[PDB]
Design a protein around this ligand. Structure first.
Ligand SMILES: *[C@](O)(C(=O)NC)[C@H](CC[C@@H](C)F)NC(=O)[C@@H]1[C@H]2CCC[C@H]2CN1C(=O)[C@@H](NC(=O)OC)C(C)(C)C
Ligand SMILES: *[C@](O)(C(=O)NC)[C@H](CC[C@@H](C)F)NC(=O)[C@@H]1[C@H]2CCC[C@H]2CN1C(=O)[C@@H](NC(=O)OC)C(C)(C)C
Lengths: 305, 305
């Protein structure tokens, strides 16, 4: 038993991290087969940042201007192209440590692990959620751009995030591995705050199921609710609407515990309207919303990769 | 910016995980050079568990009784011995992925990462602390025994923990890699509850420094305190005494922020005596004590491995 915010093992991604330098800018790249993926702003200086013309800056670069280092070995660049906000550098060596992988664009509310890197070397790993407002609550310093986020399924690494920027209040924005930003953000140093965030309701419910599985049951009340009446309360507290798809996805946890989803919703309604009164759930004094239903099942059933 | 509970990248440890089976018992082992380390209770059945005589059970095993699997390849066992609560199985193949490593016995209050594994395969990674009562607050299911905890320094993996058991209230107990338990615990299924835990004061202070570095400054008051007067308050709230060694270890964070340790102690005293009043610090509604001073510096300065 026990319940922790748990990241995926990072080794398969570690073997893909490299350093990319263009001029005086160094950041991280992801080396898969014979291509290195990195943020296109590697070709910028600081002054370039208020409003860079990336297409124009890239036309004046050639392959040899990109210094790609995998550990202590330089990888020779033999082609390059831009796809949205990412650069793809073709190198003359395929990465022998390339895992089975996919590029996937995740949905708001889904979680993934981030391998934070500097100069192509890993610093740490932690679990995040794609917030409803398309930011993530990460931990990134200058030099971390190009760090990626990912899920693992068995042997397959699904890359879903590449880090580009920090928005006001210390939250983070980036792209999928096709270079398309999550949310309305752009890779330039201009005012662009995130929309107001919301709480991921289906994940709070999943985490309440995790608490029951772990024997932390004090918040279960004797009532039920309709989906419509629950969502009227969730709205007031800035929770996202719960959909029937969400109810179905909670099915496995509901079946394991014998607690119908709408009964758990009645317990959550009471927590929202009355607070916790100084009590904790799974050691937390706040309701946690960065575990998905699958995260709870994976951790409570010992799924391995 | 941002501050997350951040684990070490796990790849170097992933490459050392194997499965060990003896009879009907399977758990995890750690393969370094030509030795596999695992909990000695791999040689037990369930009935053996109330009070096993491990020396007696082991005398009736021979090398071939140990099925060691590294992925899909069986490793032939050519010798075996018991050291305290761990078995050391000599195998005829050295692990080519062995990292530079050490075995280290950590102190209460120090943190490490756990790579939770089942059947020799990694499930996830998370950061823990060795509690003052010599337990850890982990996430472990049956099948996770032999999972290890570790720190990394540059290229060197310092292994400090191997998982053996779960104690009442869902907390965890284990050994160093020499097989000596942390705390007064024994590897048998008998009543043996943990001592009453305490809060790791130096770590709470480190985390308050992390909050200041991240701009979350509301709790800083205008006062100072003596070390003695602070410790009288810490005692009442079940905080561990703060020592001069602790004050010195907080030096780097104190210097970075310009806040003297004893001034931060005055702010912590006020939080203890008055509570948070519904406010959060670094997103938490409780005072966090599982970041060491070094953890804060590593994360806020981008230390890599
Ligand atoms: C990466 O470009 C990097 O690591 N480069 C070596 C950095 C990472 C910073 C951490 C704190 F997230 N990000 C930036 O500096 C990005 C730049 C690329 C896209 C826009 C450029 C500015 N920038 C920012 O994050 C700024 N964000 C901003 O303007 O948001 C509105 C800022 C944090 C520097 C103010
Ligand atoms: C490992 O032995 C394992 O994974 N084996 C395949 C397990 C891991 C259990 C998770 C929940 F931590 N641990 C045990 O089952 C240990 C046994 C080895 C040492 C004592 C044996 C019982 N045991 C326990 O953890 C028990 N703890 C206990 O008796 O504490 C006082 C218990 C959790 C099964 C009750």
């Amino acid at each position: 038993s026990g319940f922790r915010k748990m990241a995926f093992p990072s080794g398969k991604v570690e073997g893909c991290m490299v350093q990319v330098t263009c001029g005086t800018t160094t950041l991280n790249g992801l080396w898969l087969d014979d291509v290195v993926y990195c943020p296109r702003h590697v070709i910028c200086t600081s002054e370039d940042m208020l409003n860079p013309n990336y297409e124009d800056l890239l036309i004046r670069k050639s392959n040899h201007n990109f210094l790609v280092q995998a550990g202590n070995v330089q990888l020779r660049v033999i082609g390059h192209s831009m796809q949205n906000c990412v650069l793809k550098l073709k190198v003359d060596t395929a990465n022998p440590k390339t895992p089975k992988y996919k590029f996937v664009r995740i949905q708001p509310g889904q979680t993934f692990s981030v391998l934070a890197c500097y100069n192509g070397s890993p610093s740490g790993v932690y679990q995040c959620a794609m917030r409803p407002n398309f930011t993530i609550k990460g931990s990134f310093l200058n030099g971390s751009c190009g760090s990626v986020g990912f899920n693992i399924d068995y042997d397959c690494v699904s890359f879903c995030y590449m880090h580009h920027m920090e928005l006001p209040t210390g939250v983070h924005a980036g792209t999928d591995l096709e270079g398309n930003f999550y949310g309305p953000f752009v890779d330039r140093q201009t005012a662009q705050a995130a929309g107001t965030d919301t709480t991921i309701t289906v994940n709070v419910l999943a985490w309440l199921y995790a608490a029951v599985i772990n024997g932390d049951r004090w918040f279960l009340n004797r009532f039920t609710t309709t989906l419509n009446d629950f969502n009227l309360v969730a709205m007031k507290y800035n929770y996202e609407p719960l959909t029937q798809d969400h109810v179905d996805i909670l099915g496995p946890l509901s079946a394991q515990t014998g607690i119908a989803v709408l009964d758990m919703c009645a317990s959550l309604k009471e927590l929202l309207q009355n607070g916790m009164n100084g009590r904790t759930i799974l050691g937390s004094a706040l309701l946690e919303d960065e575990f998905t239903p699958f995260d709870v099942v994976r951790q409570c059933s010992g799924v391995t990769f």
